[PDB]
Amino acid sequence: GSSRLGYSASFEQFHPSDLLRWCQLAEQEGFDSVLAADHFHPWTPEQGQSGFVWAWLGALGATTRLRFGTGVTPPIGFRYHPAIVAQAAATLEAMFPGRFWLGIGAGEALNEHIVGRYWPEPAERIRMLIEAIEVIQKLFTGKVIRHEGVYFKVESAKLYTMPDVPPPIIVGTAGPYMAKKTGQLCDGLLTPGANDEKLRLLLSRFEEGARAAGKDPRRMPRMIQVHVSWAETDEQAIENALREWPNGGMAFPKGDIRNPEDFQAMARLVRPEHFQGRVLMTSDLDRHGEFLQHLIDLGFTEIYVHNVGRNQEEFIRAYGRAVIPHLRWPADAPVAQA
Amino acid sequence: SRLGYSASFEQFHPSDLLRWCQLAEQEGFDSVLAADHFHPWTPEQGQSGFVWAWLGALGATTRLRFGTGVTPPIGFRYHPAIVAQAAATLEAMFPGRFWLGIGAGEALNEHIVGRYWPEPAERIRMLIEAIEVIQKLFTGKVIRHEGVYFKVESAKLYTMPDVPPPIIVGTAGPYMAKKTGQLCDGLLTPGANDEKLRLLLSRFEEGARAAGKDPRRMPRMIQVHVSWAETDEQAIENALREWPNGGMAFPKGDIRNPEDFQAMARLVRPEHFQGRVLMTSDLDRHGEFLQHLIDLGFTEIYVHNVGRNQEEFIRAYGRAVIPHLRWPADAPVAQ
Amino acid sequence: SSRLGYSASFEQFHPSDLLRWCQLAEQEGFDSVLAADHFHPWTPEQGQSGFVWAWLGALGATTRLRFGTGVTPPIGFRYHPAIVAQAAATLEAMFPGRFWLGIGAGEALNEHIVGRYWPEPAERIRMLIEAIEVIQKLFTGKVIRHEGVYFKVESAKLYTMPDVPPPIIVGTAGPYMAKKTGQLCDGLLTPGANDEKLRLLLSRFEEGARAAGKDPRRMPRMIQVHVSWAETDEQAIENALREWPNGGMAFPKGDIRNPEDFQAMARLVRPEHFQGRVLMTSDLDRHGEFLQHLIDLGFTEIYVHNVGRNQEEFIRAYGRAVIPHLRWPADAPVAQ
Amino acid sequence: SSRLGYSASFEQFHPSDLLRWCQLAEQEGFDSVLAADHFHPWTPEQGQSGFVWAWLGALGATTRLRFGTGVTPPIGFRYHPAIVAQAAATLEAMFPGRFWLGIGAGEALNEHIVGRYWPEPAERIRMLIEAIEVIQKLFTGKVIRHEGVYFKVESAKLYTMPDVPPPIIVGTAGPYMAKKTGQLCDGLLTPGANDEKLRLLLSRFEEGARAAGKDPRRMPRMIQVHVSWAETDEQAIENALREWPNGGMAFPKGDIRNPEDFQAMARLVRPEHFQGRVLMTSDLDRHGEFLQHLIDLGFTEIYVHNVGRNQEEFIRAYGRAVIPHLRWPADAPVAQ
Amino acid sequence: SSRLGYSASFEQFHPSDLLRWCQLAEQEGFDSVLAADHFHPWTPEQGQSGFVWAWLGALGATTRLRFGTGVTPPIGFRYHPAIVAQAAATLEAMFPGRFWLGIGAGEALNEHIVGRYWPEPAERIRMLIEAIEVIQKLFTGKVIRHEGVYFKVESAKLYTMPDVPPPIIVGTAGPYMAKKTGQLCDGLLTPGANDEKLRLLLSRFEEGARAAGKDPRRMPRMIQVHVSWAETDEQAIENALREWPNGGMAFPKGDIRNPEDFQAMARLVRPEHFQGRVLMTSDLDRHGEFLQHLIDLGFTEIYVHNVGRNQEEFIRAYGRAVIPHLRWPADAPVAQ
Amino acid sequence: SSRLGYSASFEQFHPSDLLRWCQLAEQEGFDSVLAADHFHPWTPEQGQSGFVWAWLGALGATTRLRFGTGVTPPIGFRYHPAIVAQAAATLEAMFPGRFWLGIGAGEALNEHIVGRYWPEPAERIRMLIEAIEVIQKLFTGKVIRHEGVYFKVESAKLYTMPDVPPPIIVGTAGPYMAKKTGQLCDGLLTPGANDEKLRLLLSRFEEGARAAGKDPRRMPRMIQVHVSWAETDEQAIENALREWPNGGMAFPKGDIRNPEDFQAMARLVRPEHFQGRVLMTSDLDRHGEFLQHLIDLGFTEIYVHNVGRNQEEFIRAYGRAVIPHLRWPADAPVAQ
Ligand SMILES: OC[C@H]1O[C@@H](O)[C@H](O)[C@@H](O)[C@@H]1O
Ligand SMILES: OC[C@H]1O[C@@H](O)[C@H](O)[C@@H](O)[C@@H]1O
Ligand code: NA
Numbered sequence A: 001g002s003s004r005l006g007y008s009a010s011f012e013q014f015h016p017s018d019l020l021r022w023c024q025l026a027e028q029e030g031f032d033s034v035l036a037a038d039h040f041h042p043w044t045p046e047q048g049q050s051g052f053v054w055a056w057l058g059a060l061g062a063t064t065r066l067r068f069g070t071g072v073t074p075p076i077g078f079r080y081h082p083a084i085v086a087q088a089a090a091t092l093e094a095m096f097p098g099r100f101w102l103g104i105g106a107g108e109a110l111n112e113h114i115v116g117r118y119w120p121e122p123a124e125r126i127r128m129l130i131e132a133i134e135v136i137q138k139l140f141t142g143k144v145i146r147h148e149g150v151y152f153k154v155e156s157a158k159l160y161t162m163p164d165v166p167p168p169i170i171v172g173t174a175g176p177y178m179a180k181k182t183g184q185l186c187d188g189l190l191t192p193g194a195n196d197e198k199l200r201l202l203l204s205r206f207e208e209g210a211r212a213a214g215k216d217p218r219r220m221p222r223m224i225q226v227h228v229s230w231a232e233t234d235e236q237a238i239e240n241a242l243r244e245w246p247n248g249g250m251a252f253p254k255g256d257i258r259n260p261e262d263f264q265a266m267a268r269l270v271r272p273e274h275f276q277g278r279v280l281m282t283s284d285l286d287r288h289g290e291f292l293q294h295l296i297d298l299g300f301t302e303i304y305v306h307n308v309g310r311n312q313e314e315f316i317r318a319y320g321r322a323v324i325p326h327l328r329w330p331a332d333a334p335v336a337q338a
Numbered sequence B: 001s002r003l004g005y006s007a008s009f010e011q012f013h014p015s016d017l018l019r020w021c022q023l024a025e026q027e028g029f030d031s032v033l034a035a036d037h038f039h040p041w042t043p044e045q046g047q048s049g050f051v052w053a054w055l056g057a058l059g060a061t062t063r064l065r066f067g068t069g070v071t072p073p074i075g076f077r078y079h080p081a082i083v084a085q086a087a088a089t090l091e092a093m094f095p096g097r098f099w100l101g102i103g104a105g106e107a108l109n110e111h112i113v114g115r116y117w118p119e120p121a122e123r124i125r126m127l128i129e130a131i132e133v134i135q136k137l138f139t140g141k142v143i144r145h146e147g148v149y150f151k152v153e154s155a156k157l158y159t160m161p162d163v164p165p166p167i168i169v170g171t172a173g174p175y176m177a178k179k180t181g182q183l184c185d186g187l188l189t190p191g192a193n194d195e196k197l198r199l200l201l202s203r204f205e206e207g208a209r210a211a212g213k214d215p216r217r218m219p220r221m222i223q224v225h226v227s228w229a230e231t232d233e234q235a236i237e238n239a240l241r242e243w244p245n246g247g248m249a250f251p252k253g254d255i256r257n258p259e260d261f262q263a264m265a266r267l268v269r270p271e272h273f274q275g276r277v278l279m280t281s282d283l284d285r286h287g288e289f290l291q292h293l294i295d296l297g298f299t300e301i302y303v304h305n306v307g308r309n310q311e312e313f314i315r316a317y318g319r320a321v322i323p324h325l326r327w328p329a330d331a332p333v334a335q
Numbered sequence C, D, E, F: 001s002s003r004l005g006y007s008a009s010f011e012q013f014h015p016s017d018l019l020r021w022c023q024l025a026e027q028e029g030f031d032s033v034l035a036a037d038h039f040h041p042w043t044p045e046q047g048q049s050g051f052v053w054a055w056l057g058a059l060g061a062t063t064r065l066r067f068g069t070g071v072t073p074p075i076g077f078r079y080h081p082a083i084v085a086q087a088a089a090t091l092e093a094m095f096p097g098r099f100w101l102g103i104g105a106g107e108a109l110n111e112h113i114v115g116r117y118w119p120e121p122a123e124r125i126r127m128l129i130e131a132i133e134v135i136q137k138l139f140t141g142k143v144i145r146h147e148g149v150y151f152k153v154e155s156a157k158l159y160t161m162p163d164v165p166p167p168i169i170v171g172t173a174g175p176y177m178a179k180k181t182g183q184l185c186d187g188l189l190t191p192g193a194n195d196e197k198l199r200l201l202l203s204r205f206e207e208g209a210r211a212a213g214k215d216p217r218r219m220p221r222m223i224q225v226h227v228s229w230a231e232t233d234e235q236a237i238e239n240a241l242r243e244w245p246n247g248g249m250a251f252p253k254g255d256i257r258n259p260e261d262f263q264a265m266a267r268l269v270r271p272e273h274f275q276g277r278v279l280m281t282s283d284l285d286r287h288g289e290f291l292q293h294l295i296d297l298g299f300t301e302i303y304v305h306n307v308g309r310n311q312e313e314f315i316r317a318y319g320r321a322v323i324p325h326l327r328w329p330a331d332a333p334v335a336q
């Protein structure tokens, strides 16, 4: 199994020009793919950014050979109508064949609240996401389609710019129910870092869903997104997590909180202990290696790593040299693409 | 020495458009106008890439200026806050290069979301409110908005260039042209006869001056359609097959389907292109047509060649047209 | 037995003139009238649009003609279905055996005035099907209630209701709705079209009727056609271009909102565009052959719209040279 | 000059009977007709409700009578204001000088069928005022647009429009709306009431007109009254109880939805309740004095509803013994 | 042993007076209270409408009486069903075994204040049925969610919830809802009516219960009646006319919006109209026989509304001459 | 003269316990009660939420305490403003001089159950200001109507209305709304905060009052504080952590929907987070000095919430060691 790893492009924290440069470097350093946040707002003012991912993805596509995906876009009609997400996905895949994966989810109020609409509870947003998947799949047939359901209405519509093979639809979720639905309805799973018991359960539910739908889950992407803090010292790594990613230490439902200023005030309660299992904080690059290998061993076929510190260039070079070449991937592991 | 290239998303695969824009840069074109469509006018045109993704590729692989021509930020395909963010991100990644072209939209694209489609005069009111939303967001502060058409809860563009991109309104309406001068940074209008073009320029100037602005330093842009080919016969045949909508001198903003335009196209004949699509192999004639528009006082011209011979068109213009155009030395460009 | 339908063009003619011409048409051997339910003309040059429902009362009281709306959209823009039902019941009650309720999916030209979401055709068909349900409930003459996707009717009864309801006729060129018409309603009205399309629509209507246990050979199959008669061919063509350029528009027109829009579109229309759509000739034998062909396909009624302003001359010419020579099947069903 | 108005009670009588009786009323000296715009009767025992707009075409074509709706609610339940405007313009165009558009705030009895929120009277007055704005825009005969609190009208024009619009008459018993009527419209219609209320409404209408620069002495002031004539007083009383118990209900009725509701309420009504509301007598001199009193108050037109089913006998009795003796002011303004 | 229900007329009496009279009624042998949930009185002359939910806390804390709403409409006008559920749960938790939640389809008199579409009775029954579903979900004492035609409830739990929920009692005179009550709820409340109607409602309730596997002989069957006791018959009749004319209105009242509307309607009411509706007599034996008859039909509880302002005198007269003589079945189910 | 307010925590305590403890607080020198209007507790561990409006009736009837909602959101989620007005009027009418209506912008914890759009705080302030207008209209005791951005009220009147309405008190920590409170309402309620914020709010309230022509020195300025008293400091801290972790959440909480959400957030809270928010000490001198400081800033009333379950011990400890030693201004305005 040949050398590789995913890089998480944190739109919440970094200017898109910096992200583009760092992705180009990550490619040179042995990373093979990019996960890009679809935000309108950062979690906190101190993070201080939120570029429009869809424009940036065109730049990335045109200046690298990396695979890339949204992690994740909510196509449930607040910022984005599902038909527009479908078109955007189809266009990226058409321009960069084999390279794009459409990552979708149920959304956060932080981003969606700007349009001033009723914000459903999570279970209802899941129902919206399932209907949005239906819309996207209809459009991905490349024919004239119509749709009318509980949440969305689509008049006669066709994607004329449509690749021969649609990009994969990946659902980002930590919910057991949706993980099973993902296996059933979509092409692969993306989930956050969590303890072994939860990760195993989500994998198991995804597999159950796939198999009951007649699909082989061993050939479907199982992707995980993790957060780490590497720096020259442990002390600096911890301080970076506290300053840059206090939301990482918030082990509670965050999808109803509307403002960066709200998270900013909540952040004041966060302490180093709260990052346990959520942000790996250490200068020891062997420990970073072991953490990632463990996740491969659980059966994840791709790992996207978000380094929370502003030392992105140093992180990328350190991983390229001391982490990525030592990871052992299974020989035939499925990657997000077609 | 310079000229604008129109990237026809209705007709051409976005990969082809990217490659042709790169070529246009080498051949002396200095800027790109990109259609924001969901559907082509006809199936025979056969494309519609998502412009916002493509603009990132263009920005990263050329030094061209570029703009949407145009996006409707009036809440069907696109909520105004998202357009503002997209614009700010393009400007931030490609400083000095992006111009946000906006308009009142066409049912062809907007009908997909299944909502009430207002009459043009009402869509103008929606566009004016959208401009207010975009400008609030472009202050780079936390803003709120509640008007007739749009609600925006506490929202801030954190990724915001020091100087916002210009807002350009695409319109052929005298009323909106005046509002454009008053509220926005420059005008984009289609090819039309001299009397209409002069009226729209005059209204734009009136609007600017009444708002305390100097219109001689604001972009006045025009988008035209031509057909160049090896023979006149081939140029005409290309216009008929590729751009019959160019021969439809009637309001098109309510027509919903490519198949509707397709059936309408069957009535279109060469005479219908008069003043709308210049069809000739004579590149001197193309030169004189463009020069006339400069002389009227347009500071930029975006040229859409309707034929599929884009590479040949670009090289023919680069050699025989662009180097001979005479622009005013200090004409304002969109940026 | 001798007969033909006259199309009253509310788009073009003052209602007083239409009333007078229908009275003349009766004298000249026409036996029925189709009346447009419009709010706007297709073009300003056409220049009229009377409220059909008031005019029909005058027609009913001053002639013995059968008459029908061709067609009313009872789908809740200009008209709520319950009001159409009442209007229909009143006409039938005042003029027993003479009225037929022609309904359809509507045009934006007329419906857009109320400023509402205009559904795509397929959805408007679903609306029409629900409207038929409302009208039929009211036609039972009892207290009814209705709640569906599109319409809500609180406790409602037509107290002024004839013993036998007027027939419901659906005007459509859609194969799907033509079948539904056979199934749910009493007869079909369709525009002039080529033989293959007309045969398909007839076949679908029959299939629908038979599957619902009805005999379609006893149900009206009506067609509405457009012609231009004048003293010369040249004048006939000129009349079509000036008066009815929309006749030369072989494309979906249901989304276009303004007379001024059609007016600008009209500038592209040429004589060739009328082929199969508006017969333009002074030769009344040719008019005869065109109409006879349609009878032969199996239409039981034909409504003729002459596009020229020469209505009185048209009517007299048809009365003398066309109507007496048409050969109808002996037992053809007519709209009640 | 000899004249009187006849009230055509759509609630009670088949439209064919009403048409025949109006033709007789013309022969017997009546000069005008007021026609109820209902969907339902007040009670099942009344038992009818023809669609007035169709019937008015028959009336127009078979008599020389003036006629008007008394009244149509153009406030977007049964009827969108733009459709009422078109209907009015068409009747006036077909029957110049003969139609008057009577409008009001509506009754739930008729409007509830469409299943919408029923505003309080004061709000329905605001809706009526906005509807007047829509109707008047359309009556300019140009392309207009409208957007207000209650109504949206996209680009719309009445192409069939008489040179002079029909008058807009507001039917109301409200002092506020009576003043608005003088200000915004062409004349007033009010029900029978005591002298103090009638004087107040007349006074308010005048105030409204004068403040708008108009001369109210040249504007119609119309009243609609209910009587019971029969061969004996006993029969006249019995007819009022059986046919028009709603006449004896001195309380707000605009929220009551069903004929069955009025039917049950009717059981409480007694002869005393008709005082000042329905004159019940066989004495035709008394009918004469009652009507003359109303002229003397300054009403320029009176529409009489006889509540009994003896319409033909009522008409002949009035024609002979009442109408020829009424003394009108010489140059009183009539609705046109 | 000895007992009877007292009706607390919020429409008529200041809540302080009602509290004092309930405390007296307890001393005089009444064992339970029915409290009207109104926002408005039927007439201005009645002149009150306290917020029942606050008053019930005072009653609960100062007596040992059972008590219930008679009735609250939990159908989302004045009150969202979740709030009714919480209010009910809190009263039962504070006063275990004492509260019964009486619910119904509501009256416009109270619900119209919020300015929403008022459905027809049949639809309001559907709303009531869905509200019962909401209340019962909340009464499980767990986190629940709900989405139906009429109501949406996001994750919600009643944390202050007694171990046993209060019974849900439906107030209705409708045969259909009476059956649904037996099926879905815990007991019935119905107004005074003739024997045939009362027997039908009891029969339907039993049928509903048994089909749902329940034993109706152990479920409350409650009736609410209206009487007028005074020193003389003349005074008793006068009190009924002045205080409770709505009692003499044998017609649907659920659409009438204003006290002033009922006030005007009241003018038609006469003593005869109270037959079977308000027993008007000074003869306390007659009161006794009337109540006993209702027990004999199988009602397990009777709530008595004396319409006169002489509440204290009524209570003492009943306590002495009526209550001790009623004979209840030995094991009759009471609302708890 | 000696006094202090007691905060009745519906989030934590069974309403029967709260009633008993308020009766004890009365005996121990407390003079008033603030009652939370919740549907849900902040955490499951708190574990309660009685319907305050029912409980207030029990309180009123069994004590002589002043009492108020702290606070009710009358902005149309759980509660329509008209119903709040009625509830308030009824309490004041039953318990004259004792009730104060505390209102605010609400929390999603309680309001989200009805499944509606939850506006940002600034918009909810606009809703609250419109609700104040509705409540004040109803408090005139006349028939009123209202139509604004957020609320519609059809003809409505509070028939049960005290001569003098209860005061309207706004609970807010916002400088803008504090000024509006001075302008539009009768007094302010605010949470414990640092001196600079409390001074700003007082200053804004005064500015608002004076600009509206009022004297703010005669209007209530109330503060609600949270403490933890126990036998040891260790126990006091432990009680705060277990019972009131939300007290240690110095961030906006108005968008958080579920008890389980707060429950998870609570896990981050530590003793330091209570600084200035919950005074945690067994030292009753320290409690005394804390409360006295607030009097010295110019608050006329203080409501104290002890977060521990040791309410009876807290009440007795305060009654003995705190309340008698507080020094109030001689003529300080109290909520009435
Ligand atoms: O238009 C902006 C830039 O675009 C380039 O491709 C042109 O060829 C340059 O001369 C110009 O500065
Ligand atoms: O078609 C119905 C009737 O219409 C009349 O005008 C015809 O002349 C008659 O022959 C026929 O009875
Ligand atoms: Na274009």
Ligand code: NA
Pocket: C011, C036, C070
């Ligand atoms: Na027509």
Ligand code: NA
Pocket: D011, D036
């Ligand atoms: Na009438």
Ligand code: NA
Pocket: F036, F070
């Ligand atoms: Na609280």
